[PDB]
Design an enzyme around this catalytic site. Structure first.
Site, mmCIF file in Angstrom:
data_model
loop_
_atom_site.group_PDB
_atom_site.id
_atom_site.type_symbol
_atom_site.label_atom_id
_atom_site.label_comp_id
_atom_site.label_asym_id
_atom_site.label_seq_id
_atom_site.Cartn_x
_atom_site.Cartn_y
_atom_site.Cartn_z
ATOM 1 N N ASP A 289 5.237 20.141 65.057
ATOM 2 C CA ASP A 289 3.985 19.872 64.325
ATOM 3 C C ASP A 289 4.289 19.442 62.913
ATOM 4 O O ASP A 289 4.892 20.167 62.136
ATOM 5 C CB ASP A 289 3.103 21.124 64.314
ATOM 6 C CG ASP A 289 1.780 20.886 63.684
ATOM 7 O OD1 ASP A 289 1.626 21.182 62.448
ATOM 8 O OD2 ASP A 289 0.849 20.376 64.361
ATOM 9 N N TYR B 111 2.544 16.524 54.724
ATOM 10 C CA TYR B 111 3.783 17.287 54.527
ATOM 11 C C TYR B 111 4.852 16.481 53.936
ATOM 12 O O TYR B 111 5.868 17.053 53.498
ATOM 13 C CB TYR B 111 4.232 17.926 55.843
ATOM 14 C CG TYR B 111 3.255 18.801 56.498
ATOM 15 C CD1 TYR B 111 2.041 19.221 55.896
ATOM 16 C CD2 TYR B 111 3.407 19.242 57.787
ATOM 17 C CE1 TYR B 111 1.104 20.034 56.516
ATOM 18 C CE2 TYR B 111 2.463 20.011 58.454
ATOM 19 C CZ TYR B 111 1.275 20.396 57.821
ATOM 20 O OH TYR B 111 0.290 21.078 58.502
ATOM 21 N N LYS C 225 -0.926 14.166 61.603
ATOM 22 C CA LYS C 225 -2.302 14.402 61.190
ATOM 23 C C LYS C 225 -2.704 13.376 60.168
ATOM 24 O O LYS C 225 -1.954 13.085 59.219
ATOM 25 C CB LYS C 225 -2.479 15.821 60.581
ATOM 26 C CG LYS C 225 -1.818 16.911 61.398
ATOM 27 C CD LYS C 225 -2.246 18.329 60.911
ATOM 28 C CE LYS C 225 -1.464 19.400 61.688
ATOM 29 N NZ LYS C 225 -0.101 19.630 61.143
ATOM 30 N N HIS D 234 -6.881 15.973 60.088
ATOM 31 C CA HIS D 234 -6.334 17.175 59.446
ATOM 32 C C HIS D 234 -7.445 18.091 58.973
ATOM 33 O O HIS D 234 -7.357 19.342 59.150
ATOM 34 C CB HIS D 234 -5.390 16.764 58.299
ATOM 35 C CG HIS D 234 -4.390 17.790 57.894
ATOM 36 N ND1 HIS D 234 -3.163 17.412 57.342
ATOM 37 C CD2 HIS D 234 -4.456 19.134 57.897
ATOM 38 C CE1 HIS D 234 -2.522 18.524 57.063
ATOM 39 N NE2 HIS D 234 -3.257 19.606 57.395
HETATM 40 N N1 LIG Z 1 -3.720 22.109 60.413
HETATM 41 C C1 LIG Z 1 -3.619 22.687 59.271
HETATM 42 O O1 LIG Z 1 -4.400 22.606 58.333
HETATM 43 C C2 LIG Z 1 -2.411 23.576 59.001
HETATM 44 C C3 LIG Z 1 -1.319 23.486 59.863
HETATM 45 N N2 LIG Z 1 -0.205 24.280 59.735
HETATM 46 C C4 LIG Z 1 0.946 24.128 60.685
HETATM 47 O O2 LIG Z 1 1.255 25.418 61.178
HETATM 48 C C5 LIG Z 1 2.648 25.711 60.829
HETATM 49 C C6 LIG Z 1 2.768 27.209 60.758
HETATM 50 O O3 LIG Z 1 1.993 27.805 59.766
HETATM 51 P P1 LIG Z 1 2.581 28.245 58.367
HETATM 52 O O4 LIG Z 1 1.492 28.681 57.659
HETATM 53 O O5 LIG Z 1 3.500 27.184 57.858
HETATM 54 O O6 LIG Z 1 3.470 29.510 58.605
HETATM 55 P P2 LIG Z 1 3.666 30.696 59.660
HETATM 56 O O7 LIG Z 1 2.473 31.524 59.731
HETATM 57 O O8 LIG Z 1 4.205 30.134 60.817
HETATM 58 O O9 LIG Z 1 4.718 31.555 58.844
HETATM 59 C C7 LIG Z 1 5.884 30.996 58.220
HETATM 60 C C8 LIG Z 1 6.558 32.120 57.446
HETATM 61 O O10 LIG Z 1 6.989 33.156 58.363
HETATM 62 C C9 LIG Z 1 8.431 33.254 58.169
HETATM 63 N N3 LIG Z 1 8.911 33.620 59.486
HETATM 64 C C10 LIG Z 1 9.052 32.736 60.563
HETATM 65 N N4 LIG Z 1 9.498 33.356 61.672
HETATM 66 C C11 LIG Z 1 9.751 34.658 61.264
HETATM 67 C C12 LIG Z 1 10.305 35.748 62.012
HETATM 68 N N5 LIG Z 1 10.641 35.694 63.267
HETATM 69 N N6 LIG Z 1 10.412 36.901 61.276
HETATM 70 C C13 LIG Z 1 10.081 36.949 60.023
HETATM 71 N N7 LIG Z 1 9.530 35.920 59.289
HETATM 72 C C14 LIG Z 1 9.402 34.774 59.970
HETATM 73 C C15 LIG Z 1 8.880 31.946 57.572
HETATM 74 O O11 LIG Z 1 10.081 32.171 56.846
HETATM 75 P P3 LIG Z 1 11.356 31.190 56.906
HETATM 76 O O12 LIG Z 1 10.888 29.797 57.217
HETATM 77 O O13 LIG Z 1 11.916 31.344 55.509
HETATM 78 O O14 LIG Z 1 12.272 31.767 57.977
HETATM 79 C C16 LIG Z 1 7.730 31.546 56.650
HETATM 80 O O15 LIG Z 1 7.805 32.283 55.424
HETATM 81 C C17 LIG Z 1 2.918 24.908 59.639
HETATM 82 O O16 LIG Z 1 4.303 24.770 59.359
HETATM 83 C C18 LIG Z 1 2.230 23.624 60.032
HETATM 84 O O17 LIG Z 1 3.045 22.921 60.949
HETATM 85 C C19 LIG Z 1 -0.325 25.360 58.781
HETATM 86 C C20 LIG Z 1 -1.339 25.437 57.934
HETATM 87 C C21 LIG Z 1 -2.393 24.516 57.979
#
Ligand SMILES: NC(=O)C1=CN([C@@H]2O[C@H](COP(=O)(O)OP(=O)(O)OC[C@H]3O[C@@H](n4cnc5c(N)ncnc54)[C@H](OP(=O)(O)O)[C@@H]3O)[C@@H](O)[C@H]2O)C=CC1
Length: 322
Positions: free
Chosen positions: A49, A54, A83, A116
């Protein structure tokens, strides 16, 4: 292998149920999305995604094309989403934006192209144009006119499937009810996690054959400038923790499994190799119904993504109950 499982979209295509999120805070270089997407693909992720917003599509495209070239995958094994950003909602700007994304990816099509957010912004050079006071500048564009331009992108072969993101029930009805509608949105990508479980929108989407795709399923990045520190911290939630201990999993894995068992397609972003590998272990255990009911008790209508830029826009999505 269960980790390759897919869900049917209304248009006859199929989407992997677990996706790899690629957004990271602006201080993180875009290279880290490249490196992490390679690792994700190696670990078994196939749904990726991203978004114009981004600013990572040359890097994510390189990752995907490197994994095609080293033979780990074929193009058809990857499901890539992009998006349409809010400054490109005007019909004449939609296909050119998708074509720009495709040129940056060096790919011939996206598997999924979604609107988006439902709030058009003034077109121009700025990604969020503002006035003197730092407030966003709105535009007036019919969401149905934007949708018809998305349909033309599917017809051109540039998007295999089309959908929406951050739409409410009223806004989905607008498209569903459009005279002449040719293609229904195959998804609605929305915030979803135990604090915002989306039960009413999920039921609506399911009634209409629209797949709900969950973002911020692990609680977000909690960036200041979008999240007040008083926000609840999903991965530290003591009940999610208790269930992780019960099942010998991790909080993250409970949060992801909850979504899979509700028929939701769930995204998970990590740029840490160990975590990427962990997250795809969601397919290796199951939760009983009684534990799903307990996780439902966490709902508190808390949004990590309020899209404050769009407060005051007629199509702001998050005032309606759902
Ligand atoms: N359509 C929209 O408007 C939006 C879409 N999105 C999409 O959704 C995706 C996911 O949402 P997003 O808000 O980015 O983040 P997530 O809710 O997926 O959380 C990401 C965080 O969790 C950490 N994390 C990941 N896996 C673990 C694990 N197993 N244990 C502990 N910590 C973990 C990551 O750390 P680290 O990376 O440092 O490991 C990062 O800090 C985005 O990347 C994007 O692709 C998000 C928001 C808006």
């Amino acid at each position: 292998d269960p980790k390759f499982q897919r869900v049917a979209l209304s248009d006859g295509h199929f989407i992997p149920v677990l996706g790899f999120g690629t957004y990271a805070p602006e201080e993180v270089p875009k290279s880290k999305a490249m490196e992490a997407t390679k690792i994700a693909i190696d670990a078994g992720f196939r749904h990726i995604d991203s978004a114009y917003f981004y600013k990572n599509e040359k890097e994510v495209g390189l990752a995907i094309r490197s994994k095609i070239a080293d033979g780990t995958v074929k193009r058809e094994d990857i499901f890539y989403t992009s998006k349409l950003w809010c400054t490109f909602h005007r019909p004449e700007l939609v296909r050119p934006s998708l074509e720009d994304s495709l040129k940056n990816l060096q790919l011939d099509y996206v598997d999924l192209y979604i609107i988006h957010f439902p709030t058009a912004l003034k077109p121009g050079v700025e990604i969020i144009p503002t006035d003197e006071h730092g407030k966003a500048i709105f535009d007036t564009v019919d969401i149905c006119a934007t949708w018809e331009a998305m349909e033309k992108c599917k017809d051109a072969g540039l998007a295999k499937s089309i959908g929406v993101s951050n739409f409410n029930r009223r806004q989905l009805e607008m498209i569903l009810n459009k005279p002449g509608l040719k293609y229904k949105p195959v998804c609605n990508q929305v915030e979803c996690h135990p604090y915002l479980n989306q039960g009413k929108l999920l039921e609506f989407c399911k009634s209409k054959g629209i797949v709900l795709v969950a973002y911020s399923a692990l609680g977000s990045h909690r960036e200041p400038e979008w999240v007040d520190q008083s926000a609840p911290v999903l991965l530290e939630d003591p009940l999610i923790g208790a269930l992780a201990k019960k099942h010998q999993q991790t909080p993250a894995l409970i949060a992801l499994r909850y979504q899979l068992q509700r028929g939701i397609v769930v995204l998970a972003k990590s740029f840490t190799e160990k975590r990427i590998k962990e997250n795809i272990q969601v397919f290796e255990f199951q939760l009983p119904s009684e534990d799903m009911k307990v996780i439902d008790s966490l709902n508190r209508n808390f949004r990590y993504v309020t899209a404050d830029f769009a407060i005051g826009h007629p199509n702001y999505p998050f005032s309606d109950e759902y």
